[PDB]
Design an enzyme around this catalytic site. Structure first.
Site, PDB file in Angstrom:
ATOM      1  N   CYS A  23       0.864  -1.176   0.000  1.00 59.14           N
ATOM      2  CA  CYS A  23       0.000   0.000   0.000  1.00 59.14           C
ATOM      3  C   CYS A  23       0.903   1.228   0.000  1.00 59.14           C
ATOM      4  CB  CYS A  23      -0.892   0.028   1.234  1.00 59.14           C
ATOM      5  SG  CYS A  23      -1.945   1.510   1.290  1.00 59.14           S
ATOM      6  N   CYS A  54      -0.315   4.159   2.372  1.00 56.81           N
ATOM      7  CA  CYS A  54      -0.489   4.082   3.817  1.00 56.81           C
ATOM      8  C   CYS A  54      -0.109   2.682   4.252  1.00 56.81           C
ATOM      9  CB  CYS A  54      -1.925   4.455   4.239  1.00 56.81           C
ATOM     10  SG  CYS A  54      -3.245   3.702   3.322  1.00 56.81           S
ATOM     11  N   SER A  55      -1.113   1.640   4.302  1.00 56.43           N
ATOM     12  CA  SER A  55      -0.663   0.348   4.895  1.00 56.43           C
ATOM     13  C   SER A  55      -1.644  -0.766   4.566  1.00 56.43           C
ATOM     14  CB  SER A  55      -0.508   0.479   6.411  1.00 56.43           C
ATOM     15  OG  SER A  55      -1.766   0.792   7.001  1.00 56.43           O
ATOM     16  N   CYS A  56      -2.605  -0.378   3.639  1.00 49.15           N
ATOM     17  CA  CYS A  56      -3.746  -1.245   3.362  1.00 49.15           C
ATOM     18  C   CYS A  56      -3.264  -2.664   3.090  1.00 49.15           C
ATOM     19  CB  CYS A  56      -4.507  -0.692   2.162  1.00 49.15           C
ATOM     20  SG  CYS A  56      -4.827   1.027   2.486  1.00 49.15           S
TER      21      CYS A  56
HETATM   22 FE    FE Z   1      -2.890   1.557   3.386  1.00 51.94          FE
END
Ligand code: FE
Ligand code: MG
Ligand code: MG
Ligand code: MG
Ligand code: MG
Lengths: 211, 191
Positions: free
Chosen positions: B96, B99-101
């Site tokens: 991601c 962000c961190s998905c």
């Molecule tokens: Fe994310």
């Protein structure tokens, strides 16, 4: 928003701090680390005060140096706190009183967002599409590396979701759109300066146009 | 200048809890979900089933959501699932960049490294070098495909099944499918 969070393709970073299958330690490395996600869900699911998209955007709105120096979970403490203050649920005064010191928040939004576009196209697998050459100052789920670039549809989602550029600002006009897995050749995105093959970006219908 | 992060995090909790906005046992319940329920052991089970059951493999690759739902593993940040299939000429990797998905319920919460600016910046542009540095050599005769998790699709990699595992039980196969195999930065190894 063309912020520092849009990191894909940025050059100059060193090694990823991991080798495969190395111990990553416990899920939470400190006793507070479960709080940002749990309180995000309290805000979203229990209070209905904001969407998950608003959490992404408020983190994007951290002052850029602040963003770059802040570890992951702390960014979400700051982001959730900011939304609680912006929505009139908490005050910064009470947060700082309870924290016993400074609790700087994300910066105010410089955009009211935008509605889901009325005019879009339903694409099919195998179709060639271009990512709309548009600049959006508020929340958007299009990384800059694919802006204006051409790729091929490999999937159209069988579900639909609110347009991030609207719901990320808490707007009432986010509608619903499917997203598309758009496959780009590595060279379409980074010319000769890449060692990869292809990159697949999951793009809302409203970010796309026929090629 | 900032108060210690622990103090700020607990201040946020206390400010909300003190106004009756956090149900009893709420954050504790989420902590338990994050620590105990969301787990790459679930993704490993899905992979081992797909490796040994051609019918399930087909379901997993055509309707990931339905396949995962059969095991009861849909959940927060894992409600629309797509599995991506490695082949002799294709290696898939997930990130991601924004962000961190991550497919939390079946991969577990993302590790620090996956959320790092280094991985977020680099893997989209130089995945071969990144994987190499991490200990995974991908030959030039193999296409690398990076899936950037930019919307609501949540991904898992279905890695190739290594030679030397013929006839293994699902339990035995699950053991070699690690979190890193599900993200795509590692290839399953025969112990
Ligand atoms: Fe994310
Ligand atoms: Mg940029
Ligand atoms: Mg610090
Ligand atoms: Mg076989
Ligand atoms: Mg046996």
């Amino acid at each position: 928003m063309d912020g520092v969070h849009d990191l894909a393709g940025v050059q100059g970073f060193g090694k990823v701090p991991h080798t495969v299958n190395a111990d990553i330690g416990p899920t939470f490395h400190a006793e507070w680390e479960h709080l940002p996600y749990s309180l995000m869900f309290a805000g979203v699911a229990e209070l209905g005060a904001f969407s998950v998209d608003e959490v992404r955007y408020v983190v994007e709105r951290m002052e850029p140096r602040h963003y770059m120096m802040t570890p992951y979970y702390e960014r979400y403490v700051i982001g959730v706190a900011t939304l609680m203050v912006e929505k009139g649920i908490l005050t910064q005064d009470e947060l700082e009183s309870l924290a016993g010191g400074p609790f700087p928040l994300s910066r105010p939004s410089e955009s009211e967002g935008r509605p889901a576009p009325v005019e879009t196209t339903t694409f099919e697998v195998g179709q060639r599409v271009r990512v709309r050459d548009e600049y959006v100052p508020g929340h958007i789920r299009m990384p800059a590396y694919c802006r204006g670039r051409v790729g091929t549809i490999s999937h159209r989602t069988t579900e639909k979701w609110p347009f991030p550029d609207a719901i990320g600002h808490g707007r009432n006009d986010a509608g619903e759109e499917p997203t598309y897995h758009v496959k780009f050749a590595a060279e379409e995105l980074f010319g000769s300066d890449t060692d990869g093959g292809s990159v697949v970006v999951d793009l809302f219908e409203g970010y796309l146009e026929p090629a | 200048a900032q108060a210690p992060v622990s103090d700020r995090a607990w201040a946020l909790f206390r400010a909300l809890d003190g106004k009756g906005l956090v149900p009893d046992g709420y954050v504790e319940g989420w902590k338990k979900t994050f620590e105990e329920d969301f787990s790459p052991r679930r993704g490993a089970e899905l992979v081992a089933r797909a490796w040994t059951d051609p019918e399930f493999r087909q379901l997993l690759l055509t309707d990931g959501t339905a396949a995962v739902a059969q095991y009861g593993y849909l959940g927060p940040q894992g409600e629309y699932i797509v599995a991506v299939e490695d082949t002799p000429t294709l290696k898939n990797v997930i990130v991601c960049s924004l962000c961190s998905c991550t497919a939390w319920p079946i991969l577990g919460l993302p590790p620090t490294w996956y959320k790092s600016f280094e991985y977020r910046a680099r893997v989209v542009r130089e995945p071969r070098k990144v994987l190499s540095e991490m200990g995974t050599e991908i030959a030039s005769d193999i296409e690398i495909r990076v899936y950037d998790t930019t919307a609501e699709t949540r991904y898992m990699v279905l890695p190739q099944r290594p030679a030397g595992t013929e006839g293994w039980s699902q339990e035995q196969l699950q053991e070699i499918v690690t979190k890193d195999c599900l993200i795509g930065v590692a290839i399953p190894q025969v112990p």
